[PDB]
Amino acid sequence: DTYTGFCIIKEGTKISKSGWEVLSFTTQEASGEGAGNGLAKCLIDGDTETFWHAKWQGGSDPLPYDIVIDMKQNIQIAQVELLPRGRGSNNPIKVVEFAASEDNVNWTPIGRFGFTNQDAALEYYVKSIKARYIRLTIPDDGGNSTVAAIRELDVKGTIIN
Amino acid sequence: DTYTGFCIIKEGTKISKSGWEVLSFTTQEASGEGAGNGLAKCLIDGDTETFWHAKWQGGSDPLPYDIVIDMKQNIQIAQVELLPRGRGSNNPIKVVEFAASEDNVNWTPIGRFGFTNQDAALEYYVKSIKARYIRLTIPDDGGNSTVAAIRELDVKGTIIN
Numbered sequence: 001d002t003y004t005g006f007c008i009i010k011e012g013t014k015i016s017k018s019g020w021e022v023l024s025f026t027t028q029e030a031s032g033e034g035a036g037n038g039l040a041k042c043l044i045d046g047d048t049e050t051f052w053h054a055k056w057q058g059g060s061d062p063l064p065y066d067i068v069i070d071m072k073q074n075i076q077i078a079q080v081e082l083l084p085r086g087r088g089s090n091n092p093i094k095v096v097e098f099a100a101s102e103d104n105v106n107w108t109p110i111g112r113f114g115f116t117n118q119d120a121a122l123e124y125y126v127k128s129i130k131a132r133y134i135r136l137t138i139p140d141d142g143g144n145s146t147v148a149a150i151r152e153l154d155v156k157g158t159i160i161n
Numbered sequence: 162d163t164y165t166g167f168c169i170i171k172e173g174t175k176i177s178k179s180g181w182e183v184l185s186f187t188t189q190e191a192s193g194e195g196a197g198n199g200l201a202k203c204l205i206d207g208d209t210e211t212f213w214h215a216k217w218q219g220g221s222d223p224l225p226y227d228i229v230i231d232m233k234q235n236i237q238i239a240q241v242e243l244l245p246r247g248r249g250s251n252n253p254i255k256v257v258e259f260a261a262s263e264d265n266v267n268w269t270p271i272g273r274f275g276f277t278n279q280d281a282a283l284e285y286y287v288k289s290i291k292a293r294y295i296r297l298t299i300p301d302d303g304g305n306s307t308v309a310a311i312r313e314l315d316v317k318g319t320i321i322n
């Protein structure tokens with residue numbers, strides 16, 4: 001079994017998510033926002049203009065919300081970027097959490113970060129690990145609300161296989 | 162350029178230093194202790210019974226003392242073991258420092274640890290890095306003395322090439 005200690009990690013290249021499969025989400029908006037848009041999957045496409053947004057139209061789901069991605073590949077995760085909705089939007093996400101897994105069974109958390117609905121990308125210095133699965137979670141305990149929206153999720157690191 | 166953050170590192174296997182070349186030391190004892198024994202190189206042989214010991218016989222060198230090893234290989238360093246002289250010896254090393262390098266030019270420190278002249282090996286949870294060169298240093302500033310002796314240095318990690 002492992003432990004958590006310090007590393008020298010280089011700032012890593014983006015891992016370009018052609019392929020990549022959202023394979024479980026708590027909530028998405030299959031209508032309100034576009035139709036083509038709002039889905040969990042809008043999060044790991046190429047498209048900026050397309051964002052994931054929690055269900056709000058005709059119902060909403062209680063927090064917490066999360067999204068598990070298969071990156072189809074073992075990878076040394078170094079950073080995690082979130083392009084927020086920004087553009088003067090009501091996106092009152094105060095806190096986000098990341099975890100990762102090699103199996104999609106035993107999860108290990110790689111940090112809890114503040115969120116800011118800025119237009120630029122949020123660079124998040126996660127605890128690096130070898131992983132194929134990341135789970136973005138919007139926790140039940142942050143001052144987070146049901147309103148939550150994210151244009152893109154990106155993973156900086158190296159490929160290692 | 163890099164930075165220092167947290168990693169999940171597994172407790173690593175020993176890297177078995179057949180090959181490996183001490184390629185610079187501050188001090189060794191080419192006489193007092195055995196003749197065959199006391200040398201910097203006694204530090205990265207197989208042999209327990211053979212230890213490095215700072216020059217003491219007919220002269221001694223002022224602190225600090227260090228020893229640079231080529232491991233002949235890029236390696237993700239996870240831990241560092243020092244078998245001390247122990248066996249009720251006067252080995253009043255209070256502090257040790259490690260650094261590592263890919264080039265043997267730009268060095269990066271991977272920790273400053275307490276030393277204890279116990280008989281068992283000292284496991285040292287260094288800051289992991291990719292490296293071919295480690296430098297063991299006995300610093301000028303520890304309460305360390307000219308008397309310093311070490312049976313073996315070992316490196317736990319993975320090979321990565």
Ligand SMILES: [Mn+2]
Nearest residue numbers: 042047050151
């Ligand atoms: Mn998008």
Ligand SMILES: [Mn+2]
Nearest residue numbers: 203208211312
């Ligand atoms: Mn020895």
